[PDB]
Amino acid sequence: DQVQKVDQYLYHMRLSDETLLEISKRFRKEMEKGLGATTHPTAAVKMLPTFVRSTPDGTEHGEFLALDLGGTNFRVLWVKVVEMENQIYAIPEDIMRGSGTQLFDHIAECLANFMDKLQIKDKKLPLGFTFSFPCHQTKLDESFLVSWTKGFKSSGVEGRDVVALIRKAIQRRGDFDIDIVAVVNDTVGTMMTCGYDDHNCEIGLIVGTGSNACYMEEMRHIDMVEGDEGRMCINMEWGAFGDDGSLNDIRTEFDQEIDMGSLNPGKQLFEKMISGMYMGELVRLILVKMAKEELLFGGKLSPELLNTGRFETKDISDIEGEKDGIRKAREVLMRLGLDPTQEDCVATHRICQIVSTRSASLCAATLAAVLQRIKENKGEERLRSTIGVDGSVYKKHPHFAKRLHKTVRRLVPGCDVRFLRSEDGSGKGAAMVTAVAYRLADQHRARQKTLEHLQLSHDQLLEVKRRMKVEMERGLSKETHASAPVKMLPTYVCGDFLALDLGGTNFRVLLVRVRGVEMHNKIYAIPQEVMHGTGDELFDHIVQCIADFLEYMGMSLPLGFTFSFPCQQNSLDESILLKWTKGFKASGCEGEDVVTLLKEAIHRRDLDVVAVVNDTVGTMMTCGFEDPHCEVGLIVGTGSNACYMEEMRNVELVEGEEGRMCVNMEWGAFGDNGCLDDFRTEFDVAVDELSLNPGKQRFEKMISGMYLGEIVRNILIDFTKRGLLFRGRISERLKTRGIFETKFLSQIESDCLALLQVRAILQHLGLESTCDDSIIVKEVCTVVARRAAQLCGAGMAAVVDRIRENRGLDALKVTVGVDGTLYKLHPHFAKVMHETVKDLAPKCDVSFLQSEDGSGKGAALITAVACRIRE
Amino acid sequence: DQVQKVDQYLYHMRLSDETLLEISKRFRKEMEKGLGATTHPTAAVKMLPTFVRSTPDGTEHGEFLALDLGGTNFRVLWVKVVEMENQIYAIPEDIMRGSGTQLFDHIAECLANFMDKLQIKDKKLPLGFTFSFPCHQTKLDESFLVSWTKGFKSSGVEGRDVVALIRKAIQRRGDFDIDIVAVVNDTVGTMMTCGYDDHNCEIGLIVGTGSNACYMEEMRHIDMVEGDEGRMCINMEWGAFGDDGSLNDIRTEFDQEIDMGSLNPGKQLFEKMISGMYMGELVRLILVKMAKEELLFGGKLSPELLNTGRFETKDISDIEGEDGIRKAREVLMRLGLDPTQEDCVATHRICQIVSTRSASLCAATLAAVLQRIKENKGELRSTIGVDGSVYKKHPHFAKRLHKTVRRLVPGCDVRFLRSEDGSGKGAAMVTAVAYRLADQHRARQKTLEHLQLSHDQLLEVKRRMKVEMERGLSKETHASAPVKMLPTYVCGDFLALDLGGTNFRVLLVRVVEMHNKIYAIPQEVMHGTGDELFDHIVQCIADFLEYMGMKGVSLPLGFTFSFPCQQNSLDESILLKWTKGFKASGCEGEDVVTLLKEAIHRRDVVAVVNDTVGTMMTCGFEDPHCEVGLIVGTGSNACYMEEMRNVELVEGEEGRMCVNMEWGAFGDNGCLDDFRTEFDVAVDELSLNPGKQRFEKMISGMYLGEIVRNILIDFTKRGLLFRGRISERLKTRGIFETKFLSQIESDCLALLQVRAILQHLGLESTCDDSIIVKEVCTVVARRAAQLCGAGMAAVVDRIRENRGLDALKVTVGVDGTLYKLHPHFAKVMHETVKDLAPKCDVSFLQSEDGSGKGAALITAVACRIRE
Ligand SMILES: O=P(O)(O)OC[C@H]1O[C@@H](O)[C@H](O)[C@@H](O)[C@@H]1O
Ligand SMILES: O=P(O)(O)OC[C@H]1O[C@@H](O)[C@H](O)[C@@H](O)[C@@H]1O
Ligand SMILES: O=P(O)(O)OC[C@H]1O[C@@H](O)[C@H](O)[C@@H](O)[C@@H]1O
Ligand SMILES: O=P(O)(O)OC[C@H]1O[C@@H](O)[C@H](O)[C@@H](O)[C@@H]1O
Ligand SMILES: OC[C@H]1O[C@H](O)[C@H](O)[C@@H](O)[C@@H]1O
Ligand SMILES: OC[C@H]1O[C@H](O)[C@H](O)[C@@H](O)[C@@H]1O
Ligand SMILES: OC[C@H]1O[C@H](O)[C@H](O)[C@@H](O)[C@@H]1O
Ligand SMILES: OC[C@H]1O[C@H](O)[C@H](O)[C@@H](O)[C@@H]1O
């Protein structure tokens, strides 16, 4: 009778499965639009990342404060991991629509109140803050309010970080303090409260003052967060669906008018059709219109019926739920100053049903789109999913839940789906999220506490420079030379040619035609066998290489031998190998004169071995050919070392106090006496002790390409076994030596790269790493290479200020010729070191010329000098 | 039958289609590795963008110089559109391998000389620079050398912009100058010289000193370039295929030894198996091994044979193409050998195997290129442009390739087109385009310069406002004045109305508690009659009281009426003119209180205030120093507290009165026409109120988008945007709403996002289109902000001078959707006020509650007067 004419009147608020399924297809399209990098800014449904990546583990423990803000009751809670305590606090409408300062002032006063009450005012606890509004966050411990919704409207919060505003409020008091703050939306918090009981909970649903839902989406579909691994909770903010007009064929004149009367007009239009803040008024407006048209109350209207907000959603609930539902309808209408007729009262009851059945069916529509998406993500033929729910409408309306459960299960019949009702509220799930924020905060702090040991301050680097300086004196003084770590070895450096370059990445033989300088070469591999074997086999091979090269070259010539190891030179052509370094370990060579060994090996098969030089010395000469001022050699490659022009007065191991001689410092051994043990870490010790030459080349082991990877690797390994990286499992391939080679350290730290890019390279090296594992590894490397650069820089600082003090000069212009694969591949080493020298040696103007022709050119030039000498 | 003894020994050098197919599957994977943003950094095949989006067009014309560098012959050319003239110049081996400076001086010299040859030295011509090496570029007119390859090794060039280096070379001369330089790989130039002849040319191949190919790829697959519209030529740099060891089961021990003796060890590993620089030496290394194992020449080995580079690629070519075996004898003999007729048979076969693997390796990677182009299109009729010594000169290389590849990709109609003019022709074509783009950009900039105002220009606008402010305040001049300086007569529970902004509101203000409801004003009413409008207004007022639960109760009402009104008192205001979009009949010239009262009769108006004035008061409720009101929304206007002795239209010289400036009409006497552009004129002349509100029309949110749109239309029809296509949607008034203008200019948006916003508006845009649109909006909103600042600067300095102060501290209350939505307007105006009015310390307070609050507060101070 009345029932069937209300249904014809409100025909367009009674929604078929056909239109419901259409609505959910549109919503789906809005989900994708919101998640896409390029369409997201134009998206009504914002699909906001939350950085909640999982439901609880069960490993969460701790004591927490919480706040629950945005629903019908503002609540301050205390949670232990579950023991909970809470108290509801009132927020006056004038504060709800006052200044942010006022708002957060209030929250902070309430919080203080509660801490006193529980007697914890002096504890500094972490805080799980449920903030039921759309927020921009790039991590758990921040959230920038995008927009207020519902009945909030404080000036100056929108665009600001609610964690900062609340801290600032607290610190305007001094009363108390808090630790880390994690911020979750209420949908997220509710998912987390429920997933605490059923870890399969993947959706969070709120039907209360407003309506919204989050869900767990695949990271590969979340364009706005770098990463493709696993899932992350997306707060959809679905209340703003249709804010672009997408549901105008669904919206009626009554929704339009609710909108015209709203605090946030134009906005949250889907919500305005569903949520409890709006439902009662929707029904007041349907009644008012019907009464103006003379279809109810015989065309009469009280002023209470016309007065906004007078018909409550509580009244919808009550009317639809009381056993005398007609009598309850009558009771409400009489509080509105009417005398309705049994007929009127059946119409009123029926509008309540129509209004609230649409609310349930709209949610069903969009929920059905989210379940379909989740079904496609899992790949599975029919799906299993748990939705966690809170809110006054779902909890208190007598039928909403049922209608929702039914409508959904019909719209998606290939779904198995359990609805869990939240009993404890969002604060619990918000404590679970802060469990993790805290953990992550703590692990980070632990990682940088370790990496702080590998960071040196200006003053530590002045001290490293000073120590280098007293070690330089020690090895130059003949009185102390035998006992010195830094040997400061006299080099005796004061046509067509052959050259050898032995001891870096490549062994080359070279033809160096001087007239300018024309250079040829061939690289010759030295097999692991020969390299591990006897002096005879090595030099046999060297000679075999020379012979091949002469044929290759279509050709007996004078020879400059670049031999990049510590040698005692008694003259330019007698060099005795003190010890092998780097990776060389051939027998019957140390303590022998390598020219003899070479000559012996040539006899077996002749040539004119005129000079033997270190790579530093060869590189200095290659570079000084371009530049009068080049007085120093530096190598930063496989090993590291430096030579420079010392004064003969200071070179006590060579008779003569006039003129100059180049000194090969062999600085890699700096620290072999203990003189750097306060700067050395447990990782430097591990690299040293597990090396071929333990207790030796300690400086170089902190600097050079052969060793950094191993500093890094030993660190990464330490972190993982402390649970701070790689989910705590030590890949048997991280147990593997030498994986972190100069190329894959210089790449990882390139700053033209983005993070997935860096992740690409780590992936590519055969270590399986998340974007989180990869920012760590990248920092561990940046740190190890920065220290290397700076130590090298402090060593060099020592060298330039020495040359300057040796000449009594007040300032020094000088060039340093440089080579080595680390120096020339690594994005920052070169600059960090040049910067370090600039800071630590102010009275020196050092220029670093990178060698483009290798040591073999400069070796050719000292041989050519030696030759002209002996003629 | 050495022929079969050779094949079993050189077995891993004879490639079955099974291993060519694998190679191509691998190469396709490396193609996708290099194109992908996350994997590009570590891709061995770099897949480098060239910024060539198209083969020639017939639209190319001009006189270009050209350089051709990195092949066997360095050339300088002159191209006119085709007439060509060229000269080859030697680059010595010590210069090729000397220093950057030295290499570039030499190129500068040879250029200078060529210009003397052709007598064309006075000229400043653009130049197409074919530079045959891997280069990073983000535009046609730059190229940063990634790495030397082949025989080059000049220091101080890797990492630098070869256009910058060549420029420093020429100015170190002074001898001459050049215009715009565009740089292309030689694959790209070779694709482009053939594309002039055949416009279906989509690949560019080079098999010569080195080997490399480029192709037209879909922009949607080029992650490394922002955009997905159309295509772009990608310089694959496939010579480096295998550099990460991805071909180490194909590569042999000879390929390894070639690499150990090369200038660039470990790089260009795929090239080293193919190209001419390497093929002769490859064959020599095979002869030298076989001889050593006593398999040829009875193991008797000459020094020539053992000497690097004595077996040339010309020797391979000659042998395969002349009696194969008498030519091999002759060559082997020249290398000091004494060959049997069997040795001569091996040698000739070795040559075949090595030159056939070369062609086959190319076919395999080229197969994959064609499959990819197939998929892109959706079906395959492609032309390949080719060049390089090995292809041009060697007898069977081309045919081996055409066969191997046409066999490898069966569903394909692939014309191979040999280039006879060389890269320079196609590089001049690309340069034609670079020049054009430079020119179009220069035209656009020149236009927008008209909307950019200097500090001095803005001081002049401030000054001119100052004089119109005086003009309007004075009784002797006020009837002439465009800036009207209207006296406002501003010195429990209330109603308010808020009319003339984006939303019409009725309010209940409880003295502060505020409620409101928006009511729509349909087009019927908007362009209807005064009677219908006020009837509507009164229907809404009546609705509101019911809604607010006080039906028919008579409250004192504050009417915010956002139009120029002569106020004879607070409760008597005569509408001078409609502005913005209002147009109801029989209203202008009438007392809006009377028209209100009348429509009430058909079913207590204490005060009528402008929105600037209500906003001044809404804001002053919380800040004593707020004595100015500003609106930048649909329109723009300001009001402020004047000294009664300055207000000549009101008798009295004591105290202060608010003056509603109605500054939107500044310029209606012609006083800004030197700052007004053709697009301002157009916006005015197609407005409802032509000739009126001219200042406002350069500032406010109803108009700014129409100025933008007009600039975009002018650019478009001038060929400078949207491919000169005037999208029909572009012709739709009002599309550039304030929310979109604000969004477009956000510093958060990547460019693909800006573009996405425009396609949402309904405008088809390339990323390059979006660059231009964002800038035009940026320039227009910046001028708007700045003009507003010049205006406010006048007003605040005025309040100071009026009180003989030397420093003023003052708040401005502000409202309007442009002011509050736009990312930079607020800031840019505040800055401008700061710069133009330095003796004043101006704070701007944003109204949170709308004009209605202020209007109700004025009313409450009215209701006080009369008690
Ligand atoms: O608006 P209502 O009915 O209070 O429902 C939503 C609220 O429900 C509460 O149970 C939760 O703790 C809140 O986080 C949530 O916002
Ligand atoms: O150890 P690396 O990386 O190969 O670099 C150092 C070597 O670099 C080469 O460039 C020099 O020619 C060698 O003399 C030197 O030993
Ligand atoms: O290296 P080659 O054999 O000269 O072949 C490739 C060259 O061929 C020429 O014809 C082109 O004009 C050059 O741009 C290109 O470098
Ligand atoms: O034209 P807009 O953008 O709506 O802004 C101006 C309007 O802003 C409203 O907020 C004010 O209350 C009105 O009085 C004013 O006219
Ligand atoms: O409180 C329930 C929902 O209300 C509104 O939709 C809010 O904007 C949203 O953040 C929240 O989840
Ligand atoms: O390769 C550079 C350096 O490596 C090692 O440290 C050698 O000991 C040293 O002599 C050499 O200069
Ligand atoms: O000249 C042919 C090719 O030679 C080398 O491979 C260059 O790296 C490449 O850029 C060029 O196209
Ligand atoms: O709304 C702001 C301004 O818009 C228009 O310029 C009106 O002329 C003016 O009265 C108003 O203050």
Domain end residue (candidates: A394, A422, A450):
A422
Contacts of residue B307 in chain A, CB cutoff 8 Å? 551-554
For residue A377, the tally of other CB atoms under 10 A from its CB is 17
| Domain final residue pick, B392, B419, B446 | B419
Of B42, B94, B260, the CB nearest to A761: B42
Distance CA B204, CA B201 (A): 8
Q: Do B548 and A506 touch (CB under 8 A)?
A: no
> Considering every ligand atom, which ligand is closest to the CA of A211?
5
- A116/B contact by beta carbon, under 8 A: no
Report which of B332, B337, B327 is spatially closest to residue B300, judged by C-alpha positions: B337
B636 is in an annotated binding site: yes
Rounded to a whole number, what is the distance in Å from the CA of A308 to chain B's nearest CA?
5
- Centre of ligand 3 from the C-alpha of residue B392, in Å: 10
| Angle, CA B833 vertex, CA B831 and CA B835 arms, to 5° | 70
C-alpha span between B339 and B745 (Å, rounded):
78
Site to probe by mutation for ligand 8, drawn from B637, B738, B795, B847 as the one with most ligand atoms within 8 Å of Cβ, is: B637
Query: Within 10 A of A659 (CB to CB), how many other CB atoms are there?
Result: 11
Domain that includes residue A115, residue range: 38-199+423-440
Judged by its nearest atom, the ligand closest to the C-alpha of residue A637 is: 2
Residues whose CB is less than 8 angstroms from the CB of residue B581 and which lie 6 or more positions away in sequence, other chains included: B526, B634, B688, B702
B701 is in an annotated binding site: yes
Q: What is the bridge-based pairing of β-strands B572-575 and B565-569? A: antiparallel
Nearest in space to B301 (alpha carbons), one of B339, B328, B254: B339
Q: How was this structure determined?
A: X-ray
Q: Which atom of ligand 4 is nearest to the CA of B850?
A: 12
Task: Give distance in angstroms: CA of A507 to centre of ligand 6.
Answer: 14
* Pair (A581, A518) in one structural domain: yes
Residue A868 lies in a domain: yes
Rounded CA-CA distance A793/A838 in Å is 9
CA dihedral B126, B129, B130, B134 (to 10 degrees): -140
Residue pair B526/B587 in contact (Cβ under 8 Å)? The answer is: no
Ligand 4 atom with the smallest distance to the CA of B611 is 14
Q: How many residues are recorded in chain A?
A: 871
B56 Cα to chain A: minimum distance (Å): 32
Taking a C-beta distance cutoff of 8 angstroms, is the pair B127, B179 a contact? yes
Q: Tell me the CA–centroid distance for residue B635 and ligand 8, in Å.
A: 5
Number of A to B CB contacts under 8 A, please give it: 94
Residues with Cβ within 8 Å of A579's Cβ and at least 6 positions away in sequence, in order, are A565, A566, A590, A693, A696
* Burial (Cβ within 10 Å: 0-12, 13-18, ≥19) of residue A49: buried
**Tokens found for residue B230:** 């159309």
Phi, then psi, of B161 in degrees rounded to 5: -85, 110
| Residue B615 domain flag | yes
- Residues contacting residue A452 through CB under 8 Å, at least 6 positions apart: none
Q: Which of A251, A330, A358, A508 is catalytic?
A: A508
Question: Is the CB of residue A637 below 6 angstroms from any atom belonging to ligand 6?
Answer: yes
Whether residue B761 lies inside any domain: the answer is yes
Identify whether A220 is part of a domain: yes
User: Contact at 8 Å (CB) between B655 and B644?
Assistant: yes
Task: Report the C-alpha gap between B360 and B363 in whole angstroms.
Answer: 5
B38 touches A at CB < 8 Å:
yes
Q: Which atom of ligand 3 approaches the CA of B206 most closely? A: 6
On whether both B616 and B634 belong to a single domain, the answer is no
* Pocket lining: B635 vs ligand 8, CB cutoff 6 Å: yes
Which of B265, B547, B743 is the closest to A307 by Cβ? B547
Q: What DSSP character marks residue A11?
A: G
Instruction: Supply angle C-alpha A725, A726, A728, rounded to 5.
Output: 80
Name the residue type at position B415.
R
DSSP for residue B633: S
Q: Which residues are near ligand 7 (CB < 6 Å)?
A: B 70-71, 132-134, 149-150, 185-187, 206, 208-212, 237, 239, 271
Sole residue written with tokens 């429920």: A194
Is A260 in Cβ contact with B756 (below 8 Å)?
no
Q: Give the residue whose CA is nearest to atom 7 of ligand 4.
A: B501
Interface residue of A97, A246, A308, A549 to substitute, partner B, most B CBs within 10 Å: A308
Ligand 1 atom nearest to CA at A427: 12
Residues B647 and B767 in one domain: yes
- Phi/psi of residue B111, nearest 5 degrees: -65, -60
Residue A424 annotated among the catalytic residues of the structure: no
Are B525 and B533 contacting, i.e. CB atoms less than 8 angstroms apart?
Answer: yes
Measured CA to CA in angstroms, residue A696 lies from A301, A468, A567, A667, A699 at distances of: 99, 16, 15, 11, 9
Determine which residue's CA is closest to atom 6 belonging to ligand 2.
Answer: A820
In sequence order, what are the residues at sequence separation of 6 or more whose Cβ sits closer than 8 angstroms to the Cβ of residue B175? B108, B112, B121
Residues of A in contact with B546 (CB under 8 A): 303, 306-307
Dist. CA A299–CA A37, nearest whole Å:
54
Which ligand is the nearest neighbour of the Cα of B72?
Answer: 3
**Do B472 and B535 share a structural domain?**
no
Interchain CB distance below 8 Å, A41 and B749? yes
Residue A550 neighbours by CB under 8 Å, 6+ apart: none
CA distances from A171 to A142, A208, B703, B827 (A): 17, 33, 46, 29
**Backbone dihedral region for residue A607 (phi beyond 0: left; psi -120 to 50: alpha; all else: beta):** beta
Cβ neighbours of B159 (radius 10 Å)? 10
Dist. CA B310–CA A384, nearest whole Å:
74
Ligand 2, residue A706: give the atom nearest the CA: 1
Of the candidates A424, A615, A773, A801, the residue annotated as catalytic is: A615
Q: Are residues A244 and A388 in the same domain?
A: yes
> Using a 6 Å cutoff on CB, does residue A49 contact ligand 2?
no
Tell me, yes or no, whether B637 and B738 share the same domain. Answer: yes
Q: Nearest residue of A to residue B37 by CA position?
A: A757
- Radius of gyration over every alpha carbon of chain B, rounded to an integer in angstroms: 39
Find the angle CA(A778)-CA(A781)-CA(A785) to the nearest 5 degrees. Answer: 140
CB-based contact (8 Å) between A174 and chain B?
Answer: no
Alpha-carbon torsion (B858, B860, B863, B864), positive or negative? negative
Which tokens go with A127? 């805080």
Strand order in the sheet with B383-387: B48-49, B231-235, B211-218, B201-207, B383-387, B415-418
Q: Which residues of A touch B549 (CB under 8 A)?
A: 303-304, 306-308, 310
Is A743 an interface residue toward B (CB < 8 Å)? no
Please count the structural domains in chain A.
4
Residue A840 burial (C-beta neighbours within 10 Å; 0-12, 13-18, 19+): buried
Of A192, A139, A219, which Cα lies nearest the Cα of A440?
A139
CATH of the domain at A538: 3.30.420.40
What residues does A509 pair with on adjacent strands? A500, A522
The alpha-carbon gap from A699 to the nearest alpha carbon of chain B, in Å, equals: 31
* Alpha carbon distances (Å) from A761 to A733, A741, A746, A748, B236: 15, 12, 11, 7, 21
- Note whether A39 contacts B: Cβ–Cβ < 8 A: yes
Selecting among A564, A575, A704, A769, the annotated active-site residue is A564
Q: Give the distance (Å) from ligand 3 centre to CA of residue A32.
A: 49
Residues with Cβ within 8 Å of residue A674, at least 6 apart in sequence: none
Contact criterion met (CB below 8 Å) for A65 and A413? no
d(CA B537, CA B525): 10
Asked if residue B230 and residue B186 are part of one domain, the reply reads: no
CA–CA gap between residue A428 and residue A432 (Å, rounded): 6
In a domain, residue A446? The reply is: no
Task: Confirm or deny that B209 is annotated as ligand binding.
Answer: yes
How far, in Å, CA of B737 to CA of B734, rounded? 6
Cα(first)–Cα(last) distance of chain B, in Å? 128
Q: Which residues of B are catalytic?
A: 505, 562, 611
Dist CA B823 CA B745 (whole Å): 7
Neighbours of A300 (CB within 10 A): 12
State whether A764 and B42 contact (CB < 8 Å).
yes
- Residue A453, in any domain of the structure: no
Residues A190 and A215 in one domain: no
Give the resolution to one decimal, in Å: 2.5
Residue B449 lies in a domain: no
Contact A366, A374 (CB under 8 A): no
Nearest-10 crossing angle of helices A342-378, A17-35: 50
Q: Give B274 Cα–ligand 7 centroid separation in angstroms.
A: 12
- SS3 of B527-561: CCEHHHHHHHHHHHHHHHHHHCCCCCCCCCEEEEE
User: B201-207 and B135-136: which strand pairing?
Assistant: unpaired
Q: Which two tokens stand for residue B481?
A: 């004045």
Q: Does A229 touch chain B (CB under 8 A)?
A: no
Please report which ligand is nearest the Cα atom of B504: 4
Shared domain check, B105 and B47: yes
In a domain, residue B444? The reply is no
Q: How many CB atoms lie within 10 A of CB B375?
A: 11
What are the pocket residues of ligand 1 if the criterion is a CB atom closer than 6 Å to any ligand atom?
Answer: A 68, 70-73, 130, 132, 186, 189, 206, 208-209, 390-392, 425-426
- State whether A389 and A427 are in the same domain: no
User: Among A395, A374, A377, which residue's Cα sits nearest to residue A385?
Assistant: A374
Q: Are residues A163 and A214 in the same domain?
A: no
Cβ pair B518:A260 closer than 8 A: yes
> What CATH number has the domain bearing residue A241?
3.40.367.20
Whether the Cβ atoms of residue B286 and residue B305 lie closer than 8 Å to each other = no
Spatial CA neighbour of B416 closest among B387, B390, B443, B448: B387
List, in sequence order, every residue forming a beta bridge with A135; answer none if it has no partner.
A145
Q: Which residue's CA is minimally distant from atom 15 of ligand 3?
A: B71
Residues B177 and B238 in one domain: no
CB atoms within 10 A of CB A337: 13
Kindly identify which residue of chain A lies nearest to residue B506, measuring between CA atoms: A261
